[PDB]
Antibody
Framework: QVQLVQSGGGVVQPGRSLKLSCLAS????????INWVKQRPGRGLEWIGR????????HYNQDFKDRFTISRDKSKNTLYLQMNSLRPEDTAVYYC??????????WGQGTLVTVSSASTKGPSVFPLAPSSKSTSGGTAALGCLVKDYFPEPVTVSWNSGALTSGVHTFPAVLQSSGLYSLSSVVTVPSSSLGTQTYICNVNHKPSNTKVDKKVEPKSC | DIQMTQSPSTLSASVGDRVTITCKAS??????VSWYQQKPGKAPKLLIY???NRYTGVPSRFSGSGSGTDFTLTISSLQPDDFATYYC?????????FGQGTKVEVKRTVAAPSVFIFPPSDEQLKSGTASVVCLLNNFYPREAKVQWKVDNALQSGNSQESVTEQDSKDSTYSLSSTLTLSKADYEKHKVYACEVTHQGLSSPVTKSFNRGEC
């Protein structure tokens, strides 16, 4: 395989501090440099820093230099990343590669840190009901607008996962308000409408919400 | 400091092809550029360290070359696995910088989108808000545009969209685009239109309705 063991962070209110861990084996700990790499979703990779295996000399990035501190623990054999004074811009996935020379060979699975003022909300599921005032065309388009919730994620099924073909559940979009929203559509033969029932199955584990919205074909 | 840059950004390719990503260093390193391969929802893995030195297990298709400021990863024959996102990253000067990233995508024929414009459900209208959804369907390539026009007034800055990732079967993308507004304004207009452009469409596809009529 070739992995390490990260275990910190989650949803964190802004301005507040946070701290991640990166557990490494006794030899790995006293035999290599541990780089903490950053990656904001949809963008490349930012190197945050390193720490020599003998003493733990830390080398940061002058950006993160200002508010991120890398430490470790001999007894526990774990590296650290102190993230004080959090901004929303800190919403990213953190790794802790391990390696020889200036190489990032062994990467950890990564920990996701989500900075947001937003409270836990259940989704509002609306119908994306097929218009009868439309063209025959051939197929149709069912759907459920799962709007205003926090935090991710949601499990959208269609007819208890019996209908699985032609189902496009789009990526959650972060609205200005700070709440997500995504759609789960499934095109079907316009004739199948009426005859076969179509019910989406929304599931939001965080707010323990689970809702089954049946969508009716409606021109109006 | 040492800005690293990749190209092409995206890359249409199919099983059996000879792919080639081009990295560029604004500075001079020697052979301190590595290539990584991270797939969606996954941590990057090293392919080539040194400049040409392949890492353990990395199949003999991945090959590295170049030195100084111009580097290049080469895949001698594309496989199912090889469809992912590749990065480069100098480890010569402090700090260590990585390339923007090049995505490899399964190539197929041009397919135009099947548009569907959903009008607000009467229950969300109670909520005060009214989301008008426009679904571009099973198109290829990604490059497609959506233009919302309320009362023939081209809208701007009042919508959001999310694209789907390569279909495991169709190799076709799917795009949703929502026009979001309160109901006072939804109730203040009549015609809502989703003009859709894609390079696979002979003319722009317009879908619309009339707040009220049916």
């Amino acid at each position: 395989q070739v992995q390490l063991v990260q275990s910190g962070g989650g949803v964190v209110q802004p301005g507040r501090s946070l701290k991640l861990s990166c557990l490494a084996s006794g030899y790995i700990f006293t035999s290599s440099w541990i780089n903490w790499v950053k990656q904001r979703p949809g963008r490349g990779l930012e190197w945050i820093g390193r720490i020599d295996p003998s003493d733990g000399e830390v080398h940061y990035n002058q950006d993160f230099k200002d508010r991120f501190t890398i430490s470790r623990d001999k007894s526990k054999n774990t590296l650290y990343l102190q993230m004080n004074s959090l901004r929303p811009e800190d919403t990213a996935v953190y790794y802790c590669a391990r390696g020889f020379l200036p190489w990032f060979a062994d990467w950890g699975q990564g920990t996701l840190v989500t900075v947001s003022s937003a409270s836990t909300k259940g989704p509002s599921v609306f119908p994306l009901a097929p218009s009868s005032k439309s063209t025959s065309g051939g197929t149709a388009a069912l759907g459920c607008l799962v709007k205003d919730y926090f935090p991710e994620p949601v499990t959208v099924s269609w007819n208890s996962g019996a209908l699985t073909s032609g189902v496009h559940t789009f990526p959650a979009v972060l609205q200005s308000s700070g709440l997500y929203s995504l759609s789960s559509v499934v095109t079907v033969p316009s004739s199948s409408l009426g005859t076969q029932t179509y019910i989406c199955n929304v599931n939001h584990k965080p707010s323990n919400t689970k809702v089954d919205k049946k969508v009716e074909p409606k021109s109006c | 400091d040492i800005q690293m840059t990749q190209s092409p950004s995206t890359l249409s390719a199919s099983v059996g092809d000879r792919v080639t990503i081009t990295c560029k260093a604004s500075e001079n390193v020697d052979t301190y550029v590595s290539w990584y391969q991270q797939k969606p929802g996954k941590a990057p893995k090293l392919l080539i360290y040194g400049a040409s030195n392949r890492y353990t297990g990395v199949p003999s298709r991945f090959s590295g070359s170049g030195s100084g400021t111009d580097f290049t990863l080469t895949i001698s024959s594309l496989q199912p696995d090889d469809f992912a996102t590749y990065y480069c990253g100098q480890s010569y000067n402090y700090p260590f910088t990585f390339g923007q990233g090049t995505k490899v995508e399964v190539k197929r024929t041009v397919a135009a989108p099947s548009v569907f414009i959903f009008p607000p459900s009467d229950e969300q209208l109670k909520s005060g808000t009214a989301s008008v959804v426009c679904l571009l369907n099973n198109f290829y390539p990604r490059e497609a545009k959506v233009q919302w026009k309320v009362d023939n007034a081209l809208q701007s800055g009042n919508s959001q969209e999310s694209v789907t990732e390569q279909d495991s079967k169709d190799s076709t993308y799917s795009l949703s685009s929502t026009l979001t507004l309160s109901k006072a304004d939804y109730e203040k207009h009549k015609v809502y239109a989703c003009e859709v452009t894609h390079q696979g469409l002979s003319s722009p596809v317009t879908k619309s309705f009339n707040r009220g009529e049916c």
